[PDB]
């Protein structure tokens, strides 16, 4: 039970929560009274102020990430042993499936990062000529459409808040990395992307669109219909910490036949569930001082809708 | 040349309306915001409240909303008024303007940045006292120069309460005046003194007339200052 | 009240009251006694117009550095109460201006104490009253004693005495007072006021038989 | 936490502390007034008599060697596969 008063701003109202509460030490009697800081994602009140407690004590057991162990991509070449071998398809404009013009083969792929990311793709492969749009079918609006960019769309992601780091004795050998204070101002987690090269792109795309549905016609955008937060959001884990951007700004828009930048709204959680996994969740470690990333954005995962009006948008 | 200045009652008895005005000039009333501030005696400095160019009036909490403040665009008369007074209210009395200050450290579409508040421009500082002794006007009696630059002045004598203000010759001689403390007497009644320099070949020539004004006892005094008929 | 110290010329550095947090926007303001206030600082470093640059701020550099004024060239004319109003990302509203530090700016010159004494008015005397004044002007430090004497006797009866308070000159003035009737006015040959400056005397004598 | 005091001897001075300390039971609840004896370079004082812990408990967990498990030393000999 975590005894919470809201986070020391003024006014103008919390995400943040200065959470007091009782913990063990090494020495199996002696207790710990501490208090620590967490998003309101990870807690969850339990009904004198608001007692608290983590969201998934009551679901799933929770372990805190090695703090030397590091979440950073890395290239991963996949690679056949002898009697096997891979075959790499060549030809640029390639919708993924079908017969392959230019076959050659490698025994092991290229550098391949697994960038663990949702809505958006981040770090990734570019296309070749034109855009290429690969979905196992289209007309199942349920079979999510893939998208492989030929330029890459820049994002700059902070957390503009410098982070203190309390380490707390639990053990013999087992401690806490719990939240100090944020050192001075605070700001929320963001990203940018040039609301120019964005519509630019947006544009791009849609023309690449028309050649799967009519010489003239709608086509609009819209944030989410619902979902998770990893799909109702955007989720990815930028300087180790696990940001979630409302991407409503970037789907609001309409498109027919014929100088600044974007700010998105981002959200971090610790407890982490990922994969869904119920019964085992991890607890992601603060990270000190103010984080910032930079990604190629690179690709997306996109669905359609329903029947509803027949080819007016 | 925008210009401040109060108008103090002077005394009000415990638990009644203190009223005080600050007439605004040199300007209109609506490129600003306007506030009001106080001193205790022996006490620091007491920020009291604001009110915008909409009008809405904003106050420090510590007041227990006992204070009210109005303006009047016609007027240019910036108003104030305090009920239920006490004693420990006595204190000396300012008028300032208010710039907004807005300091922006991060994003402002999230609005990480605030609003401050600067004092530029200020008042003359009138002075007022919460009592529920009577008031008292000041005595006045024109003090006799020396017959041997020498000296001469007028007395003021028994006044409750402060302030009281001396002008020589309703404002016509200002080089020279040296005003001294006001005593404050066993009996709770102030004694001051005013005296401004002169030539020593200007006596009986000219005619020096301190200009006295009690306020609170609505006391003004025209006094005229001459030698000893030795 | 903090105190605080220091000579002439030097160049003088004030502390803020209070301890910054988030970045900030450091009001410095200067309260000469009877006088209005006066800003001096505004957004950490911007000075107003007509301000000396003798007096600067601290800029808002992300925090480390406190907020704290500089006034190099410490003159007789910088005694005063000082406040600093903070205002900050996170603290919230600044309805106070912090602790006053009221400076006194010593190492000046010492001044003859200028002493004078007025006899009861005519018009006074006619009203069954008598009050003999003593005013004291231009004079550094403002350590006096004011003292009477009746013909060659010291007297304490109502004995009212000011407070010697500074001028516009940088030099303290008092005023003293004794409470009489015109019967013990008439009575002695002279009385006289006594100023003693730094163990210096400048006394002030009058008599009711010289013209 | 322990109680330890220094071991029974007839001055001329322990190295070995006898601390009685509340240990647990197979009953989650029943709680065990036991007491060891232990060399001091193990225990640690901790600031009446004075109380001690164990070394490692503030750095690094702790098991018990298996008491069926012997530490003695046995000859092996190293050996190469076929190629080698
Ligand atoms: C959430 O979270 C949060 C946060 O926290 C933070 O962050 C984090 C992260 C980390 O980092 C941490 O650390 C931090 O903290 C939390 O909260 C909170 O916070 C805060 C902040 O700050 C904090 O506080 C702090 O603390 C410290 C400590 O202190 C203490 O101790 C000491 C020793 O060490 C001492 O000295 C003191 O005093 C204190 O206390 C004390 O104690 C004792 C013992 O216990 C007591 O005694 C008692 O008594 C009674 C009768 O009365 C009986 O007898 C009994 O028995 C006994 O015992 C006493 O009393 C006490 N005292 C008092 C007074 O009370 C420290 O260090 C610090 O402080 C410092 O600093 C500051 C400055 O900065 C100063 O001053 C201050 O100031 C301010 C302003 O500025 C003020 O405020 C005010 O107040 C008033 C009233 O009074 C009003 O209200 C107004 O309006 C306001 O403004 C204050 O008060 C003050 N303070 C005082 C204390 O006074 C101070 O003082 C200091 O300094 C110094 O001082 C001196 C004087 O004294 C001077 O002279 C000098 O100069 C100076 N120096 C300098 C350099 O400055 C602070 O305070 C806390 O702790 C926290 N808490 C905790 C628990 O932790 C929370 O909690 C959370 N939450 C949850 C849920 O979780
Ligand atoms: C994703 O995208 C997001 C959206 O874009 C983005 O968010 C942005 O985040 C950044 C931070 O990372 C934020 O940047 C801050 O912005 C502030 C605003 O800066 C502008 O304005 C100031 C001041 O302008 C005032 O004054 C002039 C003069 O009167 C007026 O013309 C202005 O209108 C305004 O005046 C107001 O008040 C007046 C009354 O007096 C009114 O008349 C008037 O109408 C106004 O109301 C300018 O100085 C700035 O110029 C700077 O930038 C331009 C180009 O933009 C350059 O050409 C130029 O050289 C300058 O660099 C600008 O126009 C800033 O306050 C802020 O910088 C201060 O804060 C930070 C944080 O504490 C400090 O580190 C820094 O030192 C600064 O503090 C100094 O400056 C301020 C302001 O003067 C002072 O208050 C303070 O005391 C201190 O000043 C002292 O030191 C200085 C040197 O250290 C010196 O300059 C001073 O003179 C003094 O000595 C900071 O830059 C930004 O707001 C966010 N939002 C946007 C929309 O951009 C996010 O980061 C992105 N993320 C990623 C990953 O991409
Ligand atoms: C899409 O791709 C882009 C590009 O691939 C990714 O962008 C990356 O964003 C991450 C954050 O998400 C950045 O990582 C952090 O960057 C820090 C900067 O390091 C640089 O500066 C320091 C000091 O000048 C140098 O020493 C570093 O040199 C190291 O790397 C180079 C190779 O570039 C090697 O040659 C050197 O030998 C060094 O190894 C860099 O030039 C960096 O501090 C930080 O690493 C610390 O933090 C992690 C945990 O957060 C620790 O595990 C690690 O040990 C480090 O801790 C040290 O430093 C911190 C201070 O940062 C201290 O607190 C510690 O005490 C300790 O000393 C981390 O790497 C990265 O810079 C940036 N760029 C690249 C190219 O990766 C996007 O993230 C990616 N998007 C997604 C979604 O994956
Ligand atoms: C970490 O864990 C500890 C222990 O669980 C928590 O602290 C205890 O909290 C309880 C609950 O409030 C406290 O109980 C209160 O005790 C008072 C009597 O205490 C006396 O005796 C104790 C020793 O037993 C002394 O330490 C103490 O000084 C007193 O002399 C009563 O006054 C209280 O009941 C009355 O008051 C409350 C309001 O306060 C009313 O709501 C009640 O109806 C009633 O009128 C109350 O029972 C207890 O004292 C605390 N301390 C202990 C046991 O040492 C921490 O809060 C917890 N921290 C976390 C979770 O962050
Ligand atoms: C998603 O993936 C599916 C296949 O997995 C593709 O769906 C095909 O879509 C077309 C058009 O909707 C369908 O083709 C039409 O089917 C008629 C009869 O279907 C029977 O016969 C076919 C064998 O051809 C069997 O596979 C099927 O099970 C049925 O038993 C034919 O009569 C049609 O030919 C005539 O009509 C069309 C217009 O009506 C003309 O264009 C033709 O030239 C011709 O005159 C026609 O072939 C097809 O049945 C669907 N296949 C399946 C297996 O369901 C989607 O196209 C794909 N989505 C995208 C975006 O690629
Ligand atoms: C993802 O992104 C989308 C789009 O950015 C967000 O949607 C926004 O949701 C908020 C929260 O409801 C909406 O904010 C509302 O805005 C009003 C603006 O107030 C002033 O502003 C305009 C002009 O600046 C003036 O015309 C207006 O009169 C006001 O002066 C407020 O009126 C609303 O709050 C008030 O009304 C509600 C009742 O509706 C009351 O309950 C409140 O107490 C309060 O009095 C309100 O804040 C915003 O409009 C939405 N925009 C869009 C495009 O939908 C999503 O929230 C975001 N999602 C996530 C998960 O981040
Ligand atoms: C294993 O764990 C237990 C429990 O933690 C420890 O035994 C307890 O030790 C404490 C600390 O001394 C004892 O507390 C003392 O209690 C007295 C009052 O006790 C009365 O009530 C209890 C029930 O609550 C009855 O059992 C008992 O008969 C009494 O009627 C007080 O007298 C004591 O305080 C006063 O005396 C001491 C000196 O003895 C002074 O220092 C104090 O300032 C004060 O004047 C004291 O608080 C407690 O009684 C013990 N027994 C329990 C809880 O049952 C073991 O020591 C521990 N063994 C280990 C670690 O090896
Ligand atoms: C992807 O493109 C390939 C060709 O690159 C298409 O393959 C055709 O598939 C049909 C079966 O529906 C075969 O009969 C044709 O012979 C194939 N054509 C060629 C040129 O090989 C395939 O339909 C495309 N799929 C999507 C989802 O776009
Ligand atoms: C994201 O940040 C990068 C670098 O942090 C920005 O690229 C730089 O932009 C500055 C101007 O802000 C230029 O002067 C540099 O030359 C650029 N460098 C590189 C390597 O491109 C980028 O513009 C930022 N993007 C957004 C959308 O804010």
């Known amino acids: 039970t975590l005894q919470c008063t809201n986070v020391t701003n003024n006014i103008t109202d919390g995400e943040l929560k200065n959470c007091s509460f009782n913990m063990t030490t090494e020495l199996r009697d002696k207790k710990q009274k501490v208090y620590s800081l967490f998003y309101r994602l990870d807690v969850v009140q339990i009904n004198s102020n608001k007692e608290y407690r983590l969201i998934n004590c009551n679901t799933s057991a929770i372990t805190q990430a090695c703090p030397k162990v590091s979440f950073e991509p890395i290239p991963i070449h996949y690679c056949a042993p002898a009697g096997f071998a891979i075959l790499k398809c060549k030809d640029k404009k390639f919708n993924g499936t079908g017969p392959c013009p230019s076959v050659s083969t490698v025994q092991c792929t290229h550098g391949i990062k697994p960038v663990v990311s949702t809505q958006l793709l981040l770090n990734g492969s570019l296309a070749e000529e034109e855009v290429m749009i690969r979905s196992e079918n289209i007309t199942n609006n349920a079979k999510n459409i893939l998208v492989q960019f030929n330029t890459p769309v820049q994002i700059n992601c902070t957390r503009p808040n410098n982070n203190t780091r309390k380490s707390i004795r639990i053990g013999p050998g087992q401690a806490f990395y719990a939240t100090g204070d944020i050192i001075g101002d605070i700001r929320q987690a963001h990203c940018n992307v040039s609301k120019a090269t964005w519509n630019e792109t947006l544009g791009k795309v849609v023309k690449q669109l028309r050649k799967h549905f009519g010489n003239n016609t709608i086509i609009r955008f819209a944030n989410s219909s619902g979902g998770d937060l990893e799909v109702t959001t955007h989720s990815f884990n930028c300087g180790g910490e696990f940001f979630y951007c409302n991407t409503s700004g970037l789907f609001n828009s309409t498109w027919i036949s014929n100088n600044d930048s974007i700010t998105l709204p981002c959200r971090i959680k610790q407890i982490i569930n990922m994969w869904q996994r119920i019964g085992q969740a991890m607890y992601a470690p603060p990270i000190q001082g103010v984080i910032r990333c930079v990604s190629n954005i690179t690709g997306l995962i996109l669905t359609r809708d329903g029947g509803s009006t027949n080819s007016t948008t | 040349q925008v210009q401040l200045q109060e108008s103090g009652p002077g005394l009000v008895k415990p638990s009644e309306t203190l009223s005080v005005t600050c007439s605004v000039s040199?300007?209109?009333?609506?490129?600003?915001?306007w506030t009001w501030i106080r001193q205790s005696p022996g006490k620091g400095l007491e920020w009291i409240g604001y009110?915008?160019?909409?009008?809405?009036?904003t106050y420090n909490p510590s007041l227990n909303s006992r204070v009210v403040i109005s303006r009047d665009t016609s007027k240019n008369q910036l108003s104030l008024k305090l009920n239920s007074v006490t004693p420990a209210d006595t204190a000396v009395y300012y008028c300032?303007?208010?710039?907004?200050?807005?300091?922006?450290?991060?994003?402002?579409?999230?609005?990480?940045?605030?609003?401050?508040?600067?004092?530029?421009?200020w008042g003359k500082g009138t002075t007022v006292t919460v009592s529920s002794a009577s008031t008292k006007g000041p005595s006045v009696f024109p003090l006799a120069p020396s017959s041997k630059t020498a000296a001469l002045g007028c007395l003021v004598k028994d006044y409750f309460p402060e302030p009281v203000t001396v002008s020589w010759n309703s404002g016509a001689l200002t080089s020279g005046v040296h005003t001294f403390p006001a005593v404050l007497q066993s009996s709770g009644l102030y004694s001051l003194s005013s005296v401004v320099t002169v030539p020593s070949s200007s006596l009986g020539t000219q005619t020096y007339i301190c200009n006295v004004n009690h306020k609170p006892s609505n006391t003004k005094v025209d006094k005229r200052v001459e030698p000893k008929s030795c | 009240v903090r105190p605080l110290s220091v000579a002439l010329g030097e160049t003088a550095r004030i502390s803020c009251g209070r301890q910054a947090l988030g970045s900030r926007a450091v009001q410095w303001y200067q309260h000469r006694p009877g006088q209005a206030p006066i800003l001096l600082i505004y957004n950490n470093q911007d000075r107003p117009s007509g301000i000396p640059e003798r007096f600067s701020g601290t800029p808002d550099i992300n925090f480390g550095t406190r907020a704290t004024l500089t006034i190099s060239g410490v003159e007789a004319g910088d005694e005063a109460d000082y406040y600093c109003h903070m205002w900050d990302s996170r603290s919230g509203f600044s309805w106070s201006f912090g602790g006053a530090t009221r400076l006194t700016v010593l190492g000046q010159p010492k001044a003859a104490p200028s002493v004078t004494l007025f006899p009861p008015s005519s018009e006074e005397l006619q009203a069954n009253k008598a009050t003999l004044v003593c005013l004291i002007s231009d004079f550094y430090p403002g350590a006096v004693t004011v003292a009477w004497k009746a013909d060659s006797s010291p007297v304490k009866a109502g004995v009212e005495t000011t407070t010697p308070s500074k001028q516009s000159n940088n030099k303290y003035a008092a005023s003293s007072y004794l409470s009489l009737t015109p019967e013990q006015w008439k009575s002695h040959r002279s009385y006289s006021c006594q100023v003693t400056h730094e163990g210096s005397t400048v006394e002030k004598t009058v008599a009711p038989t010289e013209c | 936490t322990l109680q330890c005091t220094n071991v029974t001897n007839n001055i001329t001075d322990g190295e070995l502390k006898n601390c009685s300390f509340n240990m647990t039971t197979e009953l989650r609840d029943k709680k065990q007034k036991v007491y060891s004896l232990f060399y001091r370079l193990d225990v640690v004082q901790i600031n009446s008599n004075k109380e001690y812990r164990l070394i490692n408990c503030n750095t690094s967990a702790i098991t018990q060697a298996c008491p069926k498990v012997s530490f003695e030393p046995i000859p092996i000999h190293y050996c190469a596969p076929a190629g080698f």
């Open positions: 300032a303007t208010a710039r907004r200050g807005q300091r922006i450290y991060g994003v402002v579409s999230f609005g990480e940045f605030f609003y401050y508040y600067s004092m530029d421009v």
């Open positions: 040199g300007d209109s009333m609506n490129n600003y915001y």
């Open positions: 009110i915008s160019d909409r009008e809405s009036a």
